[model samples]
Target chain A: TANVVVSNPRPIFTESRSFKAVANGKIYIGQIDTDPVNPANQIPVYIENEDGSHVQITQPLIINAAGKIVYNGQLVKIVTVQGHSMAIYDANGSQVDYIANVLKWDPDQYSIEADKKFKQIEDKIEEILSKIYHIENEIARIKKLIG
Target chain B: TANVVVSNPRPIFTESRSFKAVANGKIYIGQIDTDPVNPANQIPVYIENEDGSHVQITQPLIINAAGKIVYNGQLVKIVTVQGHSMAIYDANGSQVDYIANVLKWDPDQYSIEADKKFKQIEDKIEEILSKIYHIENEIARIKKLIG
Candidate 1:
């Protein structure tokens, strides 16, 4: 069998590096030879299937070593940071905020509109409660007159 | 200077393909050479900087060709589809839904809770309106007795 490499060559660290191919959802594993004749040239490569089996990547497989993808030359940044505790930067590439300023990077518009509607509904409920209290006062006044 | 390829080799679809590197926010542009003797071996590579200048990627720049990143071996899938359109898949590797079933795959928990709260408040307002109607009837009855 031929020693098959991925669509690209990645740095096979002494402590093996793992790469992924999204087109086929396969994990291609590679590492530098422990005692290498030429470290740069000595890279062992294989694939880890969903069944945990090591397969050979011979055909077309696009490997991702750095765990990020770029389309057309644009470095895409995720719109929203998942949860609390993420670094924030300005257009100048400076740290403007820290952990205390935990906020969703991309606030969902639907959620924002819902928040406003809820507030208005709550206010209406409060207004209704006040009107009911006024009705109770009027009933008391009428009962006194009847007595 | 060295002919720097990305962290991996993506299909240089004769038209050309753009790859991104996230670490340094650089775009490594490369494609298959036109009328190459060895298409696979003749990939011309360079970097597109933020300033729209084509720079040479010399140092430790990781390239992503497929516009996706995977840590280790996991081919990560995005949790939520942003707009009103995207493909849906089942665990059985089948298309379970189509364009008509355009729903957010990952519904935000906060938004769900807010919807429930709004419904409860609206129901309370309806209840209060009914009580106000009863109060109006009581006022009319008392006025008749006074007359």
Candidate 2:
């Protein structure tokens, strides 16, 4: 309880160094599957209030995958350089420098390749969703049997 | 059904006139709880993707209650003009134009009043959260008994 913030109603997580966040008086937790911000992308931003309480403010990072470098979206530009290497940069400056022998992919060709990857990804996602959905039905069926 | 694009492994929403979107190989839907571009406090923004399907890319709005307008904190400015109502503008002007017979109130005094209001709002929210949390626990107990 030293870490808990209790207010006559219930014990709430109210520490400065808390994993969960209390927003709009509701406690919000992270879900790995549906949350666009995964475990690695959550940044801890907290406001220390006068009442000896802390409220966290976290926003999703621009990237989906965690623990990897991100060249942030259409903001990125790639160009071939004289040193037998490719340089990638945002408007400000070069963020990544790559040297590789790769195919010069057009948008049309990229879309065709992306479509294939998309179907495979969607297939797995839908299967996962259907599993979760039907689990509720199974729970209902089991409950009815108990009754 | 014909409008739905069966991408071999997945049924993708691919009709140009669709309300849903399938991209990055996953399905995207309109968000209910949060909105990124919320001028009126939770006005969800949608991007019409390829095939005319719309996908929402929404995040949290700047305010709690709906229907009321918000200036999203600290970035807004308010000024009084002669022979006309007071004006409220942000970096982009005319976000909220206030027209009224106005009395100049000290910001320090106003902050005290806002603090009281914030406390009351927070009290109600925390109370509601407790109700939900305890009710969820009750349901868990009931379900366990059934199990």
Candidate 3:
């Protein structure tokens, strides 16, 4: 399915030659401006409709000359390909500061200490639950004996 | 460890009686204001030091009488207890609009369609990968035959 680009927006071509672009293992079908160097290369990918109109096939993702893969002109910060991750860099090629670990919840020292304390509490809770049964029976025995 | 309440932020009590509050299966030690109905019930939980000074034992979570659990005067919107979930409510006891499922990624119809398309592309890529080996061999055979 294609987007109705030629019909919706200002029509870039009344008379233009069709072309196919095969780059980076992907195909693109479009028309270029036949004008002599005024708007040098105004190429818009589209598919011809039944009534001789053109609707553009939208490119969801685009990789520019800068080797940056983006969408709608926005620079994609991070990309994962074939289980390998790539981080974004500055214009000077300096690596940006990012969270080294993105897998699980990273805990601080206080949080770890809290977890240890909670584990202790949990162990005590299990012991308390076990003792509660006998403690209840003892209460019953004592109450009956007193009566 | 406790927060230094009686010393740092204006001593609330020069001489007050110590008290123990045991509510909701938890114990709290504090000193009451001990005033005659002027500033009544200003009981801040604390632990006394060796130097006779007091520091308040911080309550991390507080559940008010309206059955609303809070922390540092902020109303906790959602709570998960014993594997059960509870959402916040309005003053009229009406449940607020919340994400129905919070377990996994909640996707839209277009996103699902995009996933289906991507899956097709992935399957095609695997097929392409397998065929590429034979295609390379065929290319070599054709080059020898043509030459």
Give the top-scoring candidate (DockQ): 1
lDDT of 3 by residue, A1-147 (tens): 422223211111100011111111111111221221122322333333346554444432233443333334543322111111112233333322111111111111233444565465556556555655655565565556556
Clash list (residue pairs), candidate 2: B16-B51, B16-B52
Considering just chain B, what TM-score does every model have?
0.35, 0.27, 0.29
Q: Distance (Å) between predicted and true CA of B22, model 3?
A: 26
lDDT per residue, candidate 2, A102-121, as tens digits?
22211113334444554565
Task: Give stretches of model 1 more than 4 Å off.
Answer: A1-102, A107-111, B1-113
Give residue A84's error in model 3 in angstroms.
32
List DockQ for all candidates: 0.08, 0.02, 0.01
Shift of residue A87 alpha carbon in model 1, Å:
4.9
lDDT, residue B86, candidate 2: 24
Model 3 stretches astray by more than 4 angstroms = A1-147, B1-70, B75-111, B139-147
Q: Please give the range of 10 consecutive residues that has the lowest summed lDDT in model 1 chain A.
A: A11-20
How far residue B116's Cα lies from its native spot in candidate 3, in Å, is 0.6
lDDT of 1 by residue, B1-147 (tens): 121211221211111122321211222211222211223322333343223355432321222332222222322212222333322232233332233222333323466667777888788789879979798688879967975
Candidate 3 per-residue lDDT over residues B5-83, each given as its tens digit = 0000100111112221111111112122222112232234333332345555443223333223333443232222111
Model 2 C-alpha lDDT per residue in residues B51-135, reported as the tens digit of each score: 6555444432122122112233321111112122222222222122221212221111233444565465556556556655665
Pairs clashing in candidate 1? A67-B69, A69-B68
Candidate closer to the true structure by TM-score (higher is better), 2 or 3: 3
**Per-model root-mean-square deviation over C-alphas:** 19.5, 28.3, 31.8
